[PDB]
């Protein structure tokens with residue numbers, strides 16, 4: 001039984017974490033084969049941060065400017081090029097602990113594990129998901145830039161997030177492992193604000209199905225709804241409109257529990273329309289949208 | 301900024317995880333040096349677990365009736381011994397991935413990461429607190445037996461938990477890597493139930509302390525309280541009575557954030573006598589007692605681990 005906000009075994013990612021130092025700026029890097037990936041604003045300073053010209057600032061750099069320390073070893077960088085907002089660094093030695101890896105770009109609502117690191121050494125691991133405003137809510141302090149999000153399915157590790165900045169609202173933004181920012185954000189200190197965050201409707205329903213598996217059924221009702229009726233209620237509560245694709249992906253859980261997906265929407269509709277009543281679902285007194293349908297099946 | 305349920309990096313632990321197979325039963329082991337640790341109920345069949353005779357099922361076993369495997373590699377068993385509810389298995393090859401480790405037993409209210417393993421392969425890591433009925437609100441299925449709980453201090457691992465059973469309330473309990481059970485539990489299949497629980501007060505205060513640091517400060521009030529005044533209300537609401545040493549542990553937080561402990565105990569006392577009134581603290585509709593003060597220090601200072 002049981003259900004928890006469980007993350008992935010971080011061991012693969014820890015063996016790839018290095019500490020990149022450029023000038024007086026020190027952030028973590030990700031050492032994969034002969035390349036060390038890190039946010040390109042490592043070459044930037046606060047003065048340049050407003051509207052930096054990275055290509056201009058990069059050609060003014062040489063390999064003797066970049067200090068990479070994988071524990072007690074200084075790494076001989078032999079190449080510096082850019083790829084969007086991710087800075088890549090060629091080195092003479094491939095990382096011995098490099099796992100089978102792949103670079104992916106996730107869609108909003110997808111969950112991934114984050115290895116929070118400071119000065120190249122891991123500090124902790126937690127589970128995050130990509131909000132629909134293209135931000136994440138993880139715990140990050142200054143110097144955590146370069147920490148990565150990932151998802152280990154099979155031996156292969158799917159890198160999908162690199163941490164770059166924290167927004168004024170406290171949420172965090174980043175890029176895929178190719179430097180493309182999630183959302184409209186750019187690697188500049190200029191005023192950027194996060195769009196209003198909608199609740200993940202599909203993940204809450206998947207989380208509910210997990211509860212039924214574990215035995216909680218108080219939220220269930222005899223009602224059902226048409227899909228159009230439910231999304232009209234959902235946006236009233238700042239929820240995400242639910243696609244037919246979302247219904248199809250919730251089918252696998254529907255079969256195992258016997259509850260129709262739209263039948264489960266009615267329980268969600270009543271739950272929003274009434275409240276938690278003090279009772280809890282899986283120990284949570286709120287509705288958890290950080291569990292994709294895949295997460296529910298994998299753990300249950 | 302931001303607050304998350306964060307666990308220790310599992311990498312040191314993953315390199316100790318092995319599978320153990322005795323007879324028909326397969327479960328997880330922990331390979332440290334030339335000895336692997338697994339719960340002693342591996343030798344048991346479901347028929348035998350009704351009335352087990354653990355001493356006698358040992359000597360019947362031979363040194364080749366334990367199929368231990370580290371990935372595809374298969375380890376060669378030298379000898380076996382039982383230490384309480386934990387079975388120790390000597391093997392020919394000492395583990396080259398053995399980290400700086402030590403066996404610790406945590407007191408209730410302590411938190412620790414629990415790497416979840418199935419068939420000797422790590423599957424997930426999550427943070428658990430030792431509840432005061434001595435159980436764990438964790439996620440476990442069949443084959444999860446042998447998963448261990450641990451803490452990382454400096455570069456030293458602290459193995460503190462081993463998972464054996466699942467109670468019928470959906471909670472879990474086990475031992476302290478020396479076979480010594482946590483709470484009134486035995487490793488047999490005969491009618492064990494989880495005792496009534498009390499909220500960990502000190503981990504609630506630290507959690508509220510975190511809310512202040514990450515902006516959320518609605519709950520603060522001008523008043524202050526006193527241990528005896530507060531604790532009297534605490535027993536009524538099935539809360540832990542707050543002791544002297546609890547405040548000293550929370551002392552660093554009160555200094556770093558600037559509001560007094562007994563001032564903050566007041567914000568809890570009013571909260572536990574008025575409800576949250578629809579407000580959410582760090583976006584949670586209920587109080588969280590699964591964050592020790594050292595846990596939030598680890599997250600508000602970013603203590604790295606080598």
Ligand SMILES: CN(C)c1ccc(N(Cc2cc(Cl)cs2)C(=O)Cc2cncc3cccc(O)c23)cc1
Pocket residue numbers: 025026041042044045046049140141142143144145163164165166167172186187188189190301
């Ligand atoms: C000059 N330099 C090294 C530098 C480094 C980081 C930043 N920024 C601002 C921007 C980054 C980008 Cl990209 C566009 S603006 C950061 O946001 C850093 C940061 C990252 N994660 C968590 C944090 C938590 C608290 C405070 C922080 O500063 C945090 C600015 C300049």
Ligand SMILES: CN(C)c1ccc(N(Cc2cc(Cl)cs2)C(=O)Cc2cncc3cccc(O)c23)cc1
Pocket residue numbers: 001325341342344345346349440441442443444445464465466467486487488489490
């Ligand atoms: C025969 N054998 C190896 C065996 C191993 C474990 C058990 N038990 C029952 C007892 C364990 C102890 Cl100690 C005293 S009774 C377990 O509880 C195992 C278990 C653990 N966690 C999650 C589970 C989820 C579903 C089903 C499970 O069986 C789960 C019974 C027999």
